[PDB]
From Swiss-Prot, chains A, B:
Catalyzed reaction equations: L-kynurenine + glyoxylate = kynurenate + glycine + H2O; 3-hydroxy-L-kynurenine + glyoxylate = xanthurenate + glycine + H2O; 3-hydroxy-L-kynurenine + pyruvate = xanthurenate + L-alanine + H2O; glyoxylate + L-alanine = glycine + pyruvate
Name listed for the protein in its UniProt record: 3-hydroxykynurenine transaminase
Thermal profile of function: Optimum temperature is 60 degrees Celsius. At physiological temperatures (30 degrees Celsius), retains 60-65% of its activity.
Pfam families: Aminotran_5
Keyword Transferase attributed: yes
Amino acid sequence: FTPPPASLRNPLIIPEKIMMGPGPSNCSKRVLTAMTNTVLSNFHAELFRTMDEVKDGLRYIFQTENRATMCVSGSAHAGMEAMLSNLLEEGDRVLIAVNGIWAERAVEMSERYGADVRTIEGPPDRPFSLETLARAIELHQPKCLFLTHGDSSSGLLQPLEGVGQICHQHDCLLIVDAVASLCGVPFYMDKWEIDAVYTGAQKVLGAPPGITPISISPKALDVIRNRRTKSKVFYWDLLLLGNYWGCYDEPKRYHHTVASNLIFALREALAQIAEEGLENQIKRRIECAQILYEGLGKMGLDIFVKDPRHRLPTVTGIMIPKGVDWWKVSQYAMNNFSLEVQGGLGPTFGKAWRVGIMGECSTVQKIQFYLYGFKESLKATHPDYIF
Amino acid sequence: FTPPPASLRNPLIIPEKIMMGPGPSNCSKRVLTAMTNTVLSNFHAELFRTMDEVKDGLRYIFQTENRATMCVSGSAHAGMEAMLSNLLEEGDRVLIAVNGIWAERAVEMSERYGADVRTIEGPPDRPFSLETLARAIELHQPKCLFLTHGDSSSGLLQPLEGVGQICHQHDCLLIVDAVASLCGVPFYMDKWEIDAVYTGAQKVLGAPPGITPISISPKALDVIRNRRTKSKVFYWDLLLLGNYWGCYDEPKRYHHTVASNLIFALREALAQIAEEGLENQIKRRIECAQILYEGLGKMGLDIFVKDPRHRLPTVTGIMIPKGVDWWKVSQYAMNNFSLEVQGGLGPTFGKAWRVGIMGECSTVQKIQFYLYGFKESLKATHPDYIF
Ligand SMILES: *Cc1c(COP(=O)(O)O)cnc(C)c1O
Ligand SMILES: *Cc1c(COP(=O)(O)O)cnc(C)c1O
Ligand SMILES: Nc1ccccc1C(=O)CCC(=O)O
Ligand SMILES: Nc1ccccc1C(=O)CCC(=O)O
């Protein structure tokens, strides 16, 4: 036996940080400690009980009644992978509206799954219009439309009202990525006639990463039932996964081992948002964004999505002013305040920082602190910047 | 906003259990509390530091020097998915030796990935001989051979010495599933000339489920670099994943958010097995299995793998005696001793219970307790059984 590594001899030390990037967010002490519960057998009654509480929690936050509501055992990417491998067969047409990094990933996945990918470009800072989409649908007769709802690479919030209805008219499924919007802005899976949605644990909910709530409509469920070939990935085949999640009128069968610890944590995160109520949580985040916009204005700082009406409240791009080294600000923030001041991604790469109003930092005091430590970080770091 | 569900208003209560099924196992308190550390950003220095300690710990337990050692973000199935999607292109020939449920799952996955699947059948209670495998390889000229090492559905341990060498002669990769064997029996990834291996967190290691250590050889890594088409699943594309895990001479790029909390837990589980040392851990499990076998004999009870030389120490099938209701015994064990007495799977389904010697229950006292509460459960539940 070639010797054990020395690096494992020190204890593990992870410092506390104020996670105000657009992910992952701070989880409440209650959510974090729920993770320390006993890992359960796939068929223990108490896991099933907890899994049911989660499905309820998910129906509340997605605002759906979908029986096929469950979690994929993976990060939000795996919700994306799941929607695409379940809903498309080789040669199917999928329409992706691309104006952010996520829609590009979707493009990358659909290609791999052997779908015939149709895209429309858009400015990273301006939503696609109802008509733009409608036109693209008629034009391509797709099986699915994929839309990013809240785009954490830009700060862009894509309106959704009416979009599904159009898709339905052209026999198309609406798939929406709500990873960065859910619990940050109104969302109505059912009213907005949306067929397949996913969020992420570690964004607005303030749950730990590695598990991804999803939901599909009876309509979508049926498209899967009627595939001519098995979907490509067994691990997130939704007939099989849905089965173990008790979404169908079938006895549950072992599929794969779920991450009990992550499921406990997610349950508590949903319990938190239930006790306070969706509406208040969304309100709280809107108000925090307002305070954020004011404080940024007052520093003569620019926001990537210029037009306020288009802004996702939970992620804001702050434009690096002309003279400034963005990374130097962040190091200062981290070292002096333990403040997470996140760089850019895709559209915002090298052009803005990104601030998240998520999880435990969605409070007035938390936004103030951010403003304070951000400013102090800029000031100490670029002494010639003018406010 | 349609009302919050009532189920979420009670506190979460998860009882302590003695988890002596063949998974998941009991995690030490240290491992469990590591999960309560701060969720880190994908680019925090301290996540990368931890990720490296993990890779070192993996090389130790796998006994490899592979640079391409990392984790998939999903349960062990996802490691299986990963090997198969990365190493196979449409039409490639894969040889799977099938004699347990896991090899069946590998069949299911390979079919979905559009491989041309070749199998050989074997009795669930007897390993595949070197000659049987060698003959099958010549016959089928496969690209990959898949073997289950330790089968948790039977308790069968498949010898591996010599297998890789044969595959190499015929230009074939050796893929091994070590989910149930690693840290329970000697395992030498490099000496045994194996090209791709995975284990699971929640089996022998005593780590929480949801993250899957894997390793690939330079030989396998190269097969992936030379594919004519992108692998079907972006999420566990190993060139991409390995990049983020800093397995290659490339700057790290964002791939997906990994599960910091599960990674913290795994790090501590590897630290634990490092401090005690492989050899000692394996010895402790062999002794425990011995005590198990004796006590089971003393009760007149039969083991599914009849020949002791073929047994996997970490999972033992206990045959249900003629008169007996297996589930009634299990309920009694749980209700009266908080003792997990798991039923069957695949080959053992309805035929046997399954006991695991894994994680925090790999001690002599724990085995004795199991024997005690098992016997008392049988006795109280089937008063006419004879010892
Ligand atoms: C227990 C076990 C598994 C289970 O996979 P999960 O996805 O973790 O449930 C897979 N392979 C083997 C050999 C096992 O023993
Ligand atoms: C943050 C985010 C992701 C990230 O996915 P992970 O796999 O959780 O890293 C995906 N989609 C959207 C819209 C996001 O905001
Ligand atoms: N917990 C479980 C509950 C039901 C079915 C399976 C499991 C497993 O953990 C799979 C590993 C095995 O049983 O061999
Ligand atoms: N922490 C990160 C660091 C780098 C890139 C991505 C992340 C993410 O958390 C998820 C995507 C995002 O919102 O940026």
